[PDB]
């Protein structure tokens, strides 16, 4: 109905149906139902501890935005140093024979 929704939402439903999914007719065919069941049946009570859950979600967001690529760069540099010295020492020593 919209301008670009008929392709973007189609690719979203295709990527939701691209991994062994026999529900390619409607990707949200069973999900949007079970959401209504959980809301109307009161399966998740909003709790005292739910605010702690929300702050843990925000904490995980901060970790996955900031600490994850920094640790990725650190681990990759250490991995490069390990593989570089371990390869170059044996190469330059074995070449002299």
């Amino acid at each position: 109905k919209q301008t670009d929704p008929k392709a973007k939402a189609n690719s979203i439903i295709n990527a939701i149906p691209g991994n062994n999914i026999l529900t390619k007719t409607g990707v949200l065919g069973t999900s949007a139902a079970a959401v209504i069941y959980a809301i109307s049946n009161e399966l998740y009570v909003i709790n005292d501890e739910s605010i702690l859950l929300l702050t843990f979600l925000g904490f995980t967001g901060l970790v996955a935005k900031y600490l994850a690529p920094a640790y990725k760069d650190f681990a990759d540099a250490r991995m490069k140093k390990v593989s570089d010295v371990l390869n170059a020492s044996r190469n330059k020593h074995v070449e002299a024979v």
Binding site: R78, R90, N91
Partner: protein
Amino acid sequence: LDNIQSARPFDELTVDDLTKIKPEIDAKVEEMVKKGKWDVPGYKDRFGNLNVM
């Protein structure tokens, strides 16, 4: 040039493969544990220990 003739999977060499080609590694590690030396002599100088502090 038999050293270069056998090719080099050092990025994917298994420690089980070194234990199979060298039982001396297994004996050295076993005696080094039995006496109690968890230190590795001469490791820290060329390889950074990466302790936090």
